[PDB]
Amino acid sequence: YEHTAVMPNKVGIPYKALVERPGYAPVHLQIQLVNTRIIPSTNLEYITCKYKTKVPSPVVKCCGATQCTSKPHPDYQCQVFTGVYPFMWGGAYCFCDTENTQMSEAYVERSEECSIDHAKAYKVHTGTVQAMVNITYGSVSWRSADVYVNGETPAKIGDAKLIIGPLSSAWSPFDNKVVVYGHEVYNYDFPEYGTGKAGSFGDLQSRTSTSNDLYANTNLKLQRPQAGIVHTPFTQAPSGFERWKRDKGAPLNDVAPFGCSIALEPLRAENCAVGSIPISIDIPDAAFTRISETPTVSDLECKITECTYASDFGGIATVAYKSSKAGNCPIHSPSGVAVIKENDVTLAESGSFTFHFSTANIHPAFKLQVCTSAVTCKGDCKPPKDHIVDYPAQHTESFT
Amino acid sequence: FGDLQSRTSTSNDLYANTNLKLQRPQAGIVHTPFTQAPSGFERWKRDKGA
Amino acid sequence: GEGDTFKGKLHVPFVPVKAKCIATLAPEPLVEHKHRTLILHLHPDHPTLLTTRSLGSDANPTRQWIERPTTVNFTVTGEGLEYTWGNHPPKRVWAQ
Amino acid sequence: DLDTHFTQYKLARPYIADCPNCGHSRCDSPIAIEEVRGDAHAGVIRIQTSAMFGLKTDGVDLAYMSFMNGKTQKSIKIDNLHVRTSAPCSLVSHHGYYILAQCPPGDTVTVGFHDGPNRHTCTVAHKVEFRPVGREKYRHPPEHG
Amino acid sequence: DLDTHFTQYKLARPYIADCPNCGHSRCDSPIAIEEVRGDAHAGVIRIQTSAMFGLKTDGVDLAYMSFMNGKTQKSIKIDNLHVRTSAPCSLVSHHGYYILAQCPPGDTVTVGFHDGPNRHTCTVAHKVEFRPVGREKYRHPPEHGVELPCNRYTHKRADQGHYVEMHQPGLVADHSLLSIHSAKVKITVPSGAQVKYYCKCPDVREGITSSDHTTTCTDVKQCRAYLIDNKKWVYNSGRLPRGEGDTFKGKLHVPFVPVKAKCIATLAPEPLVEHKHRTLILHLHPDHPTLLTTRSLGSDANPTRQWIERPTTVNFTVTGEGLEYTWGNHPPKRVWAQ
C-alpha cells in the first residue's frame, strides 16, 4: 500500500503507475505536478535609484568671509568662494569689490521617483521548495494539495497521505547575489553596501525606502559661479542608476535554463524541470477491494493498429479481451517504453476496445498489464512528416 | 516583394497575402485596430539593387 | 536669509506613480518549419529585440535588436526552444 | 475641493531668478526653470518654474497665473503659456511652482507665457528622451496594443 | 466652377470620432485623423480628418470650415487651422474631409484648428519621411537644379479619379437628450431626428419618435440615448458604429489624386577629374549623400556603386574598352585610355 517511486520532475506529464498490492485488486495511481515553486530564502541588502541634488539657497555675505561647517548631510559638499560680484534684476548686489564671498552647499538626496522605481539587491540562500500536486487515482479522480520537498512533511488532503522529495538536484538558477528591478530579475553582482563607485551601479545606496540614512558617492564638486550671477554650478557624475538601466543584460527570467520562470514574488522559480523526486504515498486500505471480485481476462491477445513514431499519442492498438464478468479494469504498462493516456476500461464478455498511447521506438515491444493479465503488444511505428503537436508526453527517449 | 499582385491596373480581382489579423479594441473605445505586416512594396523600394 | 529657515513644508504637486501606459505591438512573425530547425520570417515595424532560450541544460541565450526586415534561424533541439518576439507573450516549441 | 491647498496658495509668493538663456542672453526672467524631471515613460515632464501659477491674488481664478514683476506681483491671464522642446509641447496641468506637460524628445526645454505686450520666455539645456515601456523601442504612444 | 462638386458638399456632414491623443489624452475630438497618406515624393501629405473643410452650410465660404460640436454642427471660419509635425507644416489646400500640406520630416502628425476660446486639436503616431526624387538624398527642395519625373499629389480638387463610400452613418449616443421629467428619464429630439430608445428595464423598445418620456427606468446611465440622423451622410470611418439597417451608397470623389508631376531635384557639385596611365582618379566634394555608380563597357560589366557622404577621392582602372560613371544625377560620362 505504501508505494514508493521515483518520479521525473516535469509539470505537464502524468505518472499513471500501478500499485501491486497483494491480496487485493491492484489500483492505478496518477500524479501530476502543477507547480514546482522553489522560493529560496532571501535577505535584502539595499535599494538604489536615481538621486536628486537638493541644493539649498546660497549664503552671500556682501563684505566679509564666512567659514562653512561640516554638516551631517550625505555627501554634503560645501565650499566658500572669494571675489564675486553678483548682479540681480535690481542691480549689483553689494558695494564691496573683493570682500564679497559666497557660501554654496549641496547634498545628495534620493529622488522622489525612488518610491515607485528602485532596484533591489538580494543575497539568497538555498531555501525550501514547494509544489502543488494533483492526484486523480483510484475512483476519487481529484486532489488539490500544496506540498513541500523536505523528506519529512506528510500531505493528507482528501483520504490519501504522501511525502515528496527531497530533490535530486540542488540546482538553483539564482546566484548568491541577485538584483530585482521592479518586475525582472538580474543576477548582477552588486558590490556591497556603502562601497559603490561613482557613476557605476549603486552610486546611491539606501538600506530601505523608510531608512533616512544612505550612502551617496556621486563625486559631487561645486565650482565658482561665472560672470557674477547668483547660482550654484555643481559638477557631478551622471546618475549611476540611469546607467545600467539602458544597458543591462538579459533578465534571469529570460536566460534561466530548464524552462524556469520567475515573478515579483518570494522569488519562486516555477516549472524548473530538473532532477527527480522520490515520491512515497500511503494509500488507505479502504479503496482496496478483494481480489476475488475482479473478472478474469486471461487468454487474451493484443494487436497494434497504427503507431506513429512521434511525441503525441499517435499509437493506437486493439485488445481482444477474453473476460468472464463485467467491471472496471485499470490499464498500465510497467515498462517505460510506451505511455498510455487511457486509464480505465470497462470489460464486456469477450469484447474489444481500442486505446491510445505514444512511444519512441521504431518497433515497440512493451509489456501491457491489464488488471492482472500480461500481454506484449509488439508492432511497428512510422515517423510523422508534420511535426506540429503539443509538448512531448512520451518522455522516453533512449536507444532505438 | 509582390505582397499585393493584380493582373492589370483595372483588374477587379487581386491577390494579397499580407498577414492581416484583427486585434481586440483597446479600453472600450470604438475603433478597428489591426495587426498588419509592413508594406511589401515599400521594402525593396529602399534596398533595391543596382 | 541669514535669520532662519522658516516652516512651510509644501507637498510636491505631481508625484510619480506606477500607472499603466499603452505600448506598441509588433506584427506577428511568419513561422516556417524545417527539420529540427525553426525559421522565423518576420518584419519589424520599429526596432524590437527578440530573445531565445533553450529549455535544456545549456541556455544558449541570444538577444538581438532588429530594425530592418530579416530572416533568422534557430536549432530547435529535442529539449525544446522558446522565443519572445517583441512584447508578445512568450511561446515555446518542440522538436519532432 | 481645490481649496484644500492654501499652504501652497497663500503662504507662497511669485519668485524671479537667473534664467541662463532668457531670450537672447541671460536676463533675470520671472519664469526661470529648475529641476526638470524627465524620467517618466509616456513622454510627460514635470517642470518647476520660478513663477508660481495657481489661484489668483486671494482665492479664485485657478486659470490664472501670478508672476513677480519688479517689486510687486501681478496676477494675469494664462493665455499663451508655452512649453517647448525640439518640437512644441502640449500643456496638461499646473499647480504652484510646478507645471506638468508632455514633450517630444529634444535637447532643450523652453517655457514662456504672454503678458501681452511682452514675450517673457526662458529656456535651459537639458536632455529629454522617452523610451516606451516594453521591448519595442518606439517613439510615440500608439493607438492600440 | 467650384460649386460643381455638390455630391460631397451638401450630401455629407462631418462627425466626431475617437482621436488617439486628443489634447493630452484619448478624448473624442471633432478633428479625428484618418488615413495619413505620406507617399508623395516632395514631402507632401494628404490627411483625412473627420471634420469637413471647404464650403459653408449650403455652397459658399471656401475660407470656412464645418465641424460637429455635440449633436449639432456649427460652421465657423478657417481662422487658425494648422497642421503640425516635428516642425510646423504649411497647408496648401483643404477640401471636404481632406487636407493637403507640405510637412518637414518627422515621426508624429498633428492637425488642429483654433475655435478662439479653445484649441481642439488631434494627433496620431504616423511617421512621415522625405524621399528625394533621383539619386541625391537631400532633405529639402532646392531653389535650382535639374527637374525629374517625380510623383506628387495635385493641388486641384475637381477630379473624379477615385471614390470613397459614404453610407448612412451609424447612430450616435447623446446622454444630454436624457433630461429628467421630475422623477423619470426624459428624451428630447434634435429636429425630429430618429431617436433609437430603450432601457435595461422593460419600456418603449424601438424609439422612432418625437420627445418621449420613460415609464419604467429611472437612471440616465441605464438607457439608450441614440440619434439616427442619416438625413446627412458620413464617411465610412472605422471609428463609428455601423447602422445595421443597411449601408447607403453615395460615393464621392477623392479630392487630391496623385499625379506624375515634375519636381525640381538637387544637382551635386561637379567632380574634379585627374588621371594617370589607364587610371581615372576622381575627386568628389558632395554636400549631401549622393549615389555614385560606375560601369565598365567591356565584356565584364564589373559594376560598382556606393553612397558617399564625406568628401573623398576614389580611383578607377580604365581599360581600353572604356568606362562610364554617373555622379549624382548629372548626365553619364564615358572615357578611353592610352
Ligand SMILES: *[C@@H]1O[C@H](CO)[C@@H](O[C@@H]2O[C@H](CO)[C@@H](O[C@@H]3O[C@H](CO)[C@@H](O)[C@H](O)[C@@H]3O)[C@H](O)[C@H]2NC(C)=O)[C@H](O)[C@H]1NC(C)=O
Ligand atoms: C488532475 O489531473 C487530471 C489528469 O490530467 C485532470 O483531468 C482532466 O480534467 C479536465 C478538466 O479539468 C478534463 O477536461 C475537461 O472535461 C470537461 C468535462 O468533460 C470538459 O467540459 C472540458 O471541455 C474538458 O475536456 C480532462 O478530461 C481530464 N483528464 C485528462 C486526461 O486531461 C484533473 O482535472 C486534474 N485535477 C485538478 C483539480 O487539477
Ligand SMILES: *[C@@H]1O[C@H](CO)[C@@H](O)[C@H](O)[C@H]1NC(C)=O
Ligand atoms: C536560414 O535558413 C534559410 C533558408 O532558406 C537559409 O537560406 C539561410 O542561409 C539560413 N541562415 C542561417 C544563418 O543559417
Ligand SMILES: *[C@@H]1O[C@H](CO)[C@@H](O)[C@H](O)[C@H]1NC(C)=O
Ligand atoms: C587610389 O586609391 C587609394 C585607396 O586604395 C587612395 O588612397 C589613393 O589616394 C588613390 N590614388 C591613386 C594612387 O590612384
